Design a protein around this ligand. Structure first.
Ligand SMILES: [Mg+2]
Ligand SMILES: [Mg+2]
Ligand SMILES: [Mg+2]
Ligand SMILES: [Mg+2]
Ligand SMILES: [Mg+2]
Ligand SMILES: [Mg+2]
Ligand SMILES: [Mg+2]
Ligand SMILES: [Mg+2]
Ligand SMILES: [Mg+2]
Ligand SMILES: [Mg+2]
Ligand SMILES: [Mg+2]
Ligand SMILES: [Mg+2]
Ligand SMILES: [Mg+2]
Ligand SMILES: [Mg+2]
Lengths: 190, 251, 148, 109, 199, 138, 176
RNA sequence: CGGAGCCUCGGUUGGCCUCGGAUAGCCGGUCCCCCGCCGGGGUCCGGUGCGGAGAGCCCUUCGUCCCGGGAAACGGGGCGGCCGGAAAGGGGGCCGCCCUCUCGCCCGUCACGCACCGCACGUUCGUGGGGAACCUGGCGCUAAACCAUUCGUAGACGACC
RNA sequence: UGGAAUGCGAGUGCCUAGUGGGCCACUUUUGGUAAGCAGAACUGGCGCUGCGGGAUGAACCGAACGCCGGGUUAAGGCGCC
């Protein structure tokens, strides 16, 4: 079955300016700008109102798979609003039974060195995605804080570190060592 | 049915066909990839196998059984008198691969290099480049050469020199010189052509191309051995002595 | 062709493909047509079908030869004893199935009809299946237009 | 002066897939890409025109190397504007893919 | 004389079917930008198709064929050859009426290019379907001049942009000129509008 | 991004079919593919038509869905869709298309002469505008 | 029966041949949808034989005539009760359609049954066809058109004149 | 580089000299505003079943005579120089000249031409491709390959150095 | 009133060759796990037979054949080959 119309709307905070170049969404906020291209989805984007702006997503004559893309766009656009206003802050804890995991931040938070992971002599060097900054946590021991405006870049950056410290040829239910994503917050709490 | 016991195949199918080389002088199939941040330099040279000897040296290999100990190592001596740069050839990158763009030659070419252009030097009038050379000697022709160099600066991506060997310094019967293209790696294309243009008719010692303790590649043609059977050519197992109709075969 | 169909098609005088004949209907004949159902398309012709069939493609069987009915004397010499003396008397005896339908109809040579112009649907199945075989009733006239 | 004939192509002979009837040629006429447009060209003269080594007499002229096989369009072929043509002699297979002149006479307009 | 086609945004087999019938009627065809040609289906299942082709080789002497051409132009050429009777003189004559190019080399870079709307991807595919690029597919099966062809295609586009700006300039003058001479050409402008040439 | 909508009262141009070249009004929508249309002032009986053979115009008459032909005609005449249609460039381009199609051999001769002279006059003026622009460059 | 072209609705009335036992046998009527009247009578004898001790030999057709659509200019919702044989069973379905004619709705049922269930027309028995009010419809495909202010665009209009011209200079535009 | 022809080979019977592309979006103006080595974004205004449309555009050929009206006058035709093009490179435009014409186009006036007596292969691209020759002028060139001999970095013989 | 329909000219006699390995299919059917296996019934085929279609093929589907022109078809087809 094709549905005549399926739509959803997004509310834009006053401090965020959204402009459309076709299906390219440009969100400008206090923390910067994010541009995402949605040309791989056949939807219709509309900006409504002037005082309280809104973004509308329309899908005319959509089957089940095409209808599922309508909310996906809204959620991405909301994350972009969240990124440019509050930012994204993933925290990671390093877990170890015997060998402390030493983390050194280089290149202004764009490179992470991991040493002595399960006692390995090999040094792991993880490169953060552009626009993502890693830093050791002054508040807690054995913790990292990744910050950025793009949720996917920040969360991909953290996945790289988490998968860098993988245990091999052991029972990973026993050998639990590794750095893991422990919290998903925002840079500015508001 | 499957062969009873496993065994690796004799010889490499990667060196096929086991034919006679079409060239007597080793060809550089790939030159080192150009890095425009290094100074202009040459990437190849021509030498002649003189012979082999052995040397004594003290190895420096921590954790080895021969650390701080003297070893006897075999070595090859390759006589490499300086080469003479006689021309420049430019290449343009095309969707069908590199295409020769423009060749220039120095005003003077020695008879050793000119011998390369003939099949019978004795019977020849030695007319090679006798009309090309007049282009450097007149204002009209000179104005065309620099235009060719300017064209090479605009369009070419690869620059090579044409260096030849000096056979009058070797002890060999041969007097015809070996002439090869050497790729000029290093800076911009303009810097390549300025570098090459200053070196026309000049000599280039091997020490300007290579250095001590450098790892290089040697390209050449192996010793020829004529018609050989499978036992020698491919190193197959000899068949038993009882074999009728010959045993230096593949069964 | 199976033996029982082969005999019945010979009695209808349909020994060739796209041959045509009139058959006056009754219990005896309707059950013959049921045996040959896969091999025939039949139905009820209107007055126009009887006209055109006998005028364009009507041939008499005169001294066992196939003679075009180009003149009225041809009909009169053979069927005159039944008072059939012209093409109109012949068309009236066939169309209304008169007392001498048997004689006037055996007189006519089996009609040699051409391939249907515009094609067929499926000669291998019944008309009510979207094919061509069987009884199509008055729809035979459309078929007769395209083959006459 | 100028061209007075339509441009056609000798596409091939009349055929099934494995039988060829050389006495009928299939013609493709420039600009005629439907069957309802072929009506103008029915009955019009067609000429396969070519050159040979030996000279031949030219009507209204002196001998030259031009030769012609005449024909005419007989009926439409298919749905996309192909026409069937017939010539005084079967066309030579070397003529496939080459120009066939279609004249504007016999005029019906 | 020559029908020049632009391969960008055309589906491989539909372009070949039309091109093959065209050269069999005696027309010359040039297809440029064969790397811009498309194939329906995700890239991966089209890469597997060429790798399956790549495995076809005479087990006793691979040099005797099949020959697996890696250029997007030659891939297209072989695809048109597969729609022709190329083992007969008539088919080989047609196959010689077709030229295929990666990029747009001269003289076709300065000639107008036609398209085939019956083979265009925007027409023939549903927009949600995946598709492959012939150039990317060719690049990943041994084609060596993807980077160079793109480099030279960018130079051509820069020159074509200057040419377009010159033509827009000569069109702005053309419109202005028609206003300046409007009085003198008004009579001739009425003839054209009376017969539909000008709206 | 969408400006023309299939709705009750939308006037649609019929591009192909037995009613090619005519205007109809969407009276009702049957399903995804078909609509009930009406041409009371354009010689089209109320009937079903697919959207494939339809091109939406910019006019939208105001009558209730499935209103009878009396009120579709009444709305058509009040909006004067017939005269408004003929004033659009879309209608004019259709008119020019048919004027050119019916051109006679003599008409084609006269256009060639008018076009011949008109093009020469324009080209000469363009040459002068180019030369004038040159002097400013110098 | 082949569901060829658009079906017509036929009113077929039949009875047993009168006999000394029953000089006036009762009359039976059926709604038949078929391509022609010849098929319509054939299907009648197929249905009554399944409900009565009757068949063409021991009965006759009293009236065969086409039932004309009564409001061919009004959009209606049709509910259809049918049974059909699948590869591995028989099933009863209820289906809905929007159409101007009841025979058009029944034709849609045959195409639809063929599309969605690979059911050939010979395995389908249309039991009942009713005109249904918008408030009684059940299928969301039909109900989404019960909107007095229905509106929607025509996105991505594909070029259907793809061979006129076969070669062009400009690329097609799909937005209108 | 600058004359008649003779063979032979065929086909063809106006040209389009170019944005890039999008397709749930496009195209053209607009520099007033913002950037850059005249170009990009914004605004604003127009088009969008593409008309600044390949459903298109350009050229159009019967010829000549006489004299008028529009159109040209910054115009048509013709030897010297500088930019410019490389993916498989331009007999385009521009500047000089000493020349050479007031005709080229459109609407009229005025007559004439083998008007070959109804009829085909007409009409170009066409100084077309290839081949022999024959002339008739200027400016230029005066080689190599193979065999034979020799070598042994090669070799069954050829080939190869 | 040659006593149902329909069709058709029949009857009869001598002499007689080759054959007397068959095989295949729908349906029915025996043995066998089954077999492109062995063995039966009915009809039709191939054998003896080309031709259109099933790319190709004894038997499938259509259709059976003098040498031709025009038209139309069957079974099958109509992106290109
Ligand atoms: Mg273990
Ligand atoms: Mg093994
Ligand atoms: Mg022995
Ligand atoms: Mg027909
Ligand atoms: Mg059968
Ligand atoms: Mg000619
Ligand atoms: Mg390789
Ligand atoms: Mg058996
Ligand atoms: Mg036998
Ligand atoms: Mg027989
Ligand atoms: Mg047979
Ligand atoms: Mg098969
Ligand atoms: Mg025939
Ligand atoms: Mg086929």
């Amino acid at each position: 079955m094709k549905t005549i119309l399926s739509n959803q709307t997004v509310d834009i905070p006053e401090n965020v300016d959204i402009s459309l170049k076709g299906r390219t969404v440009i969100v400008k906020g206090p923390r910067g700008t994010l541009r995402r291209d949605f040309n791989h989805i056949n939807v219709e984007l509309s900006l409504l109102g002037k005082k309280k702006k809104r973004l509308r997503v329309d899908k005319w004559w959509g089957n089940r798979k095409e209808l599922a893309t309508v909310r996906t766009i809204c959620s991405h656009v909301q994350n972009m609003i969240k990124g440019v206003t509050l930012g994204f802050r993933y925290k990671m804890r390093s877990v170890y039974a015997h060998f402390p995991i030493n983390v050194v931040i280089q290149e202004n938070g764009s490179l992470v060195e991991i040493r002595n992971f399960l006692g390995e002599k090999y040094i792991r060097r993880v490169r953060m995605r552009p626009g993502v900054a890693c830093s050791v946590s002054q508040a807690q021991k054995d913790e990292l804080v990744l910050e950025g405006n793009d949720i996917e870049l920040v969360s991909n950056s953290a996945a790289l570190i988490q998968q860098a410290t993988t245990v091999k040829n052991k029972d990973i239910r026993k050998f639990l060592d590794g750095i893991y994503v422990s919290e998903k917050g925002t840079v500015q709490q508001a | 049915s499957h062969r009873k016991f496993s065994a690796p195949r004799h010889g490499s199918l990667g060196f096929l066909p086991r034919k006679r080389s079409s060239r007597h002088r080793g060809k550089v199939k790939s030159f080192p990839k150009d890095d425009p941040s290094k100074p202009v330099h040459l990437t190849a040279f021509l030498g002649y196998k003189a012979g082999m000897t052995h040397i004594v040296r003290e190895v420096d290999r921590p954790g080895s059984k021969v650390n701080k100990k003297e070893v006897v190592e075999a070595v090859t001596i390759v006589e490499t008198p300086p080469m003479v740069v006689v021309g420049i050839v430019g290449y343009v990158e095309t969707p069908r691969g590199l295409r020769t763009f423009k060749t220039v030659f120095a005003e003077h070419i020695s008879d050793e290099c000119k011998r390369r252009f003939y099949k019978n030097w004795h019977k020849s009038k030695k007319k090679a480049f006798t009309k090309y050379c007049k282009k450097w000697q007149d204002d009209a022709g000179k104005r065309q050469l620099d235009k060719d160099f300017s064209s090479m600066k605009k369009y070419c991506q690869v620059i090579r020199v044409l260096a030849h060997t000096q056979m009058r310094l070797l002890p060999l019967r041969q007097k015809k010189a070996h002439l090869m293209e050497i790729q000029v790696n290093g800076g911009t294309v303009a810097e390549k052509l300025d570098w090459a243009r200053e070196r026309l008719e000049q000599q280039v010692p091997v020490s300007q191309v290579f250095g001590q303790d450098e790892m290089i590649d040697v390209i050449g043609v192996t010793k020829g051995k004529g018609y050989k059977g499978v036992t020698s050519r491919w190193h197959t197992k000899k068949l038993p002595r009882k074999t009728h109709r010959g045993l230096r075969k593949v069964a | 062709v199976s033996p029982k169909v082969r005999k019945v098609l010979q009695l209808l005088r349909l020994r060739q493909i796209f041959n045509g004949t009139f058959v006056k209907l009754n219990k005896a004949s309707i059950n013959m047509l049921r045996i040959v159902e896969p091999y025939i398309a039949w139905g009820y012709p209107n007055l126009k079908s009887v006209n055109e069939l006998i005028y364009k493609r009507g041939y008499g069987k005169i001294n066992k030869k196939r003679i075009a009915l180009t003149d009225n004397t041809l009909i009169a010499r053979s069927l005159g004893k039944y008072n059939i003396i012209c093409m109109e008397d012949l068309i009236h005896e066939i169309y209304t199935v008169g007392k001498h339908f048997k004689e006037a109809n055996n007189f006519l040579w089996p009609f040699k009809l051409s391939s249907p112009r515009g094609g067929m649907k499926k000669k291998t199945t019944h008309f009510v299946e979207g094919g061509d075989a069987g009884n199509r009733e008055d729809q035979i006239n459309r078929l007769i237009r395209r083959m006459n | 002066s100028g061209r007075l004939w339509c441009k056609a192509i000798f596409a091939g002979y009349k055929r099934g897939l494995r039988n060829q009837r050389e006495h009928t040629a299939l013609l493709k006429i420039e600009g005629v890409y439907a069957r309802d447009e072929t009506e103008f060209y029915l009955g019009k003269r067609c000429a396969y025109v070519y050159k040979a080594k030996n000279n031949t007499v030219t009507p209204g002229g002196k001998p030259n190397k031009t030769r012609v096989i005449w024909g005419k369009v007989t009926r439409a072929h298919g749905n996309s504007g192909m026409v069937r043509a017939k010539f005084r002699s079967n066309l030579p297979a070397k003529a496939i893919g080459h120009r066939i002149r279609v004249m504007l006479y016999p005029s019906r307009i | 004389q020559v029908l020049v086609l632009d391969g960008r945004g055309h589906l491989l087999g539909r372009l070949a079917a039309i091109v093959a019938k065209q050269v069999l009627l005696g027309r010359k065809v040039v297809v440029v930008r064969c790397e811009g040609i498309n194939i329906s289906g995700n890239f991966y299942r089209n890469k597997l198709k060429y790798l399956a082709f790549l495995r076809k080789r005479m087990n006793t002497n691979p040099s005797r064929g099949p020959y697996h051409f890696r250029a997007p132009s030659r891939i297209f050429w072989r695809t048109v050859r597969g729609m022709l009777p190329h083992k007969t003189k008539r088919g080989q004559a047609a196959l010689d009426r077709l030229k295929v190019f990666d990029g747009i080399p001269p003289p076709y870079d300065k000639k107008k290019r036609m398209v085939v709307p019956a083979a265009l991807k925007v027409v023939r595919l549903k927009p949600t379907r995946k598709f492959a690029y012939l150039g990317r597919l060719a690049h990943e099966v041994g084609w060596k001049y993807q980077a160079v062809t793109a480099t030279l295609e960018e130079k051509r586009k820069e020159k074509a942009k200057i040419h377009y700006r010159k033509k827009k300039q000569l069109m702005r003058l053309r419109k202005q000129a028609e206003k300046n001479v409007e009085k003198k050409i008004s009579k001739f402008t009425d003839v054209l509008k009376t017969h539909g040439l000008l709206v | 991004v969408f400006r023309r909508f299939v709705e009750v009262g939308r006037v649609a141009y019929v591009s192909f079919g037995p009613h090619a070249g005519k205007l109809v009004a969407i009276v009702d929508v049957i399903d995804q593919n078909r609509a009930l249309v009406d041409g009371p002032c354009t010689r089209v009986r109320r009937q079903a038509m697919p959207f494939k053979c339809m091109q939406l115009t910019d006019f939208i008459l105001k009558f209730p869905h499935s209103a009878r032909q009396k009120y579709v005609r009444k709305a058509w005449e009040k909006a004067d869709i017939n005269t408004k249609w003929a004033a659009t460039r879309w209608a004019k381009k259709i008119e020019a298309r048919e004027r050119k199609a019916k051109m006679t051999d003599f008409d084609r001769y006269k256009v060639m002469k008018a076009k011949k002279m008109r093009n020469r006059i324009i080209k000469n003026e363009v040459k002068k505008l180019q030369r004038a622009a040159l002097l400013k460059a110098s | 029966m082949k569901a060829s072209g658009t079906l017509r609705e036929y009113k077929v009335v039949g009875r047993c041949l009168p006999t000394p036992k029953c000089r006036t046998p009762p009359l039976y009527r059926m709604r038949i949808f078929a391509p022609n009247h010849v098929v319509a009578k054939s299907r009648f004898w197929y249905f009554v034989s399944q409900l009565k001790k009757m068949k063409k030999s021991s009965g006759e057709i009293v009236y065969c005539g086409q039932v004309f659509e009564k409001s061919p200019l009004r959009v209606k919702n049709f509910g259809i009760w049918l049974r059909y044989d699948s590869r591995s069973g028989t099933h009863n379905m209820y289906r809905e359609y929007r159409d101007l004619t009841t025979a058009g709705a029944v034709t849609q049922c045959y195409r639809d049954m063929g599309a969605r269930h690979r059911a050939r027309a010979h395995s389908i028995q249309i039991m009942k066809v009713e005109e249904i009010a918008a408030s009684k419809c059940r299928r969301p495909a039909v109900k989404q058109f019960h909107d007095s202010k229905i509106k929607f665009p025509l996105p991505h209009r594909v070029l259907r004149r793809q061979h006129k011209p076969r070669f062009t200079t400009k690329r097609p535009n799909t937005f209108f």
